[PDB]
Amino acid sequence: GRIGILGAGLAGLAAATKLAEAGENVTVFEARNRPGGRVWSETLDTPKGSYVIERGAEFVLDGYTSMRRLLSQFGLSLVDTGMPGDTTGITCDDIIRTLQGTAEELLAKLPDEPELVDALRARIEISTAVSASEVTARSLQHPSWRVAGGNQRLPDAMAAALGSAVRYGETVRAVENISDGGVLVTTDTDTSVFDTVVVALPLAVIRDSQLNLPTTEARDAALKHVLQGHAAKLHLPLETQPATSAVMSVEGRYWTWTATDESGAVAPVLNAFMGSPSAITRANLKQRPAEWVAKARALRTDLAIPQDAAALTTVWSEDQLAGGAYAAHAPGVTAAGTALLEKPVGDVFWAGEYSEPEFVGLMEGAIRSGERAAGRVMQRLETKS
Ligand SMILES: Cc1cc2nc3c(=O)[nH]c(=O)nc-3n(C[C@H](O)[C@H](O)[C@H](O)COP(=O)(O)OP(=O)(O)OC[C@H]3O[C@@H](n4cnc5c(N)ncnc54)[C@H](O)[C@@H]3O)c2cc1C
C-alpha cells in the first residue's frame, strides 16, 4: 500500500499529511534539505535586532480556509499585517468597459496615453508575474495576515510530524508507470517502487526535459495555456520602525511594504516583490544589485535604509527546484483543462499550485490541490484492494 509523494512543498506535505491521517504508509522525496518549497522563512539582521522575513510566499489572504484549518491543528497563529492616484483605477474601469484575449490587447484599445497605460500595465505585470501580452484579460477584473514566527513554520511542522517518511536530499529524475500496476520512482542514485505516486513538483519541473515523467497529449494541450509567473523577493533593513505602508514602482515592476509582526510593532524591514520576467531582467539583480537599492531608496525616501545596506535577493526563477514563482493563465485556460491536470496517468497522481481552479498560484491552492490528490489516491488504493 506504499505511496510515494514527490516534493515537500505545501502541496506534497498536505497530501502526505492527509494520507498519514488515513493510516497509509507514505514516503516523501525532497531535493532540498528543508521542507516548504516556495514557503521559505528566514531572519534578517537590522539595527533594531533580528526579524523574520518571507523569502517566498508572504500573505495569507481572505478565504484561505484549508490553510487556517492546518494552522489550528499545528498550533500556529495569524498576525494582521496592518496594511497617478486613482487614475489607474479609472483607467482599469475604462479598460474593462471596452474577457477574451490578453490584457495587452485590451490596453491597446485605451486612448494612447502611454505613461498612464504603462502604470496600469505595471500593476497587471507585478501581480500576474507575466507579460501583459500573454496573460488573460480576465486578470483585469482583479486585509492580510502572516504566520507568527514565519510561514515556513507550517510546512516545518507538517514535515516534522511525518518523521523519517520525509527523505531529504533526494532529486527525482524519472517516474515510470508499470503496465500491471505500480510506479517506479528514480532519483539521481536509485529506484524505489510504490503502488501509487503523487507528483507534487513545480510546474517548471514537471515540464523540464531533464526529467522523464508520464505525459499525454491531452495534458500537454492543457499545460500549454498555463504560464510560468516569475518573481523575486527583495529585503532591506531599516534603521527604525516605520509606519505600515504599501508603495508600488511602475518603472521597476515591484511593490514595497512594511508590516506589523506578532509584537504589534511594524518590523524595521523593507519588504519587496518584483514580478514578470522582463522586469527582473531589466533590474539586473544578479550583476549590479546596488542599482535596485538606489531605486528603492529613491522610491521610499520616507524609510530609513542604512547607507551601506545591501539587498537580500531571492530570484526563484534561477532555482532549478522552483523555476519561477507561481502559475498564470493564458486566454485559453478552461475549467475542463484545469481539472484534467489533476487526473492520474496510470498510478501517477498530481498536485500543485498550478492546477488549483480558484486559489490559483497561492498557498491555499497548493494545500487544496494536495488534499484533493490524497482523496483520489485513497480511492485508487481501495480499488487495488
Ligand atoms: C516570491 C513569491 C511570492 C509569493 N507570494 C505569495 C503570497 O503572498 N501568498 C500566497 O499564498 N502565495 C504566494 N506565493 C506562492 C506560493 O509560494 C506557492 O503557491 C506555493 O508555495 C507552491 O507550493 P507547491 O507545493 O505547489 O510547490 P513548491 O513549494 O515549489 O514545492 C515543490 C517541492 O518540490 C521540490 N522539488 C523540486 N524538484 C524536485 C525534484 N526533482 N525532486 C524532488 N523534489 C523536488 C522543491 O524543492 C519543493 O520543495 C509566492 C511565491 C513566490 C515564489
From Swiss-Prot:
Q: Reply yes or no: does the keyword Oxidoreductase apply.
A: yes
Q: Which reaction does it catalyse?
A: 4-(methylamino)butanoate + O2 + H2O = succinate semialdehyde + methylamine + H2O2
Where FAD is bound, by residue?
30, 32, 38, 353
Cofactor(s) recorded for this entry are: FAD
> Which SUPFAM superfamilies does the UniProt record give?
FAD/NAD(P)-binding domain
**How does the record characterize pH dependence?**
Optimum pH is 9.8.
* Keywords of the record: Flavoprotein, Oxidoreductase, Plasmid
Q: Which Gene3D superfamilies match?
A: FAD/NAD(P)-binding domain
Q: Pathway it acts in?
A: Alkaloid degradation; nicotine degradation
The GO biological-process annotations, alphabetized, read as:
nicotine catabolic process
The EC number on file is 1.5.3.21
* Factors inducing expression: Is transcribed only in the presence of nicotine.
Q: Which GO terms describe its molecular function?
A: oxidoreductase activity
Complex formation: Monomer.
Q: Which PANTHER family is this protein grouped with? A: FLAVIN MONOAMINE OXIDASE (PTHR10742), LYSINE-SPECIFIC HISTONE DEMETHYLASE 2 (PTHR10742:SF410)
Q: What role does it play? A: Catalyzes the removal of methylamine from 4-methylaminobutanoate with the formation of succinate semialdehyde. Is involved in the catabolism of 4-methylaminobutanoate produced from nicotine. Has a very weak monoamine oxidase activity with 4-aminobutanoate. Cannot use spermidine, spermine, sarcosine, dimethylglycine, glycine, choline, betaine, alpha-methylamino isobutyrate, methylamine propionitrile and methylamino propylamine as substrate.
What family is this protein classified in? Answer: Belongs to the flavin monoamine oxidase family.
Q: Give the protein name, as stated in the record.
A: 4-methylaminobutanoate oxidase (methylamine-forming)
- Species in which this protein is naturally found: Paenarthrobacter nicotinovorans
Name of the gene encoding the protein in the UniProt record: mao
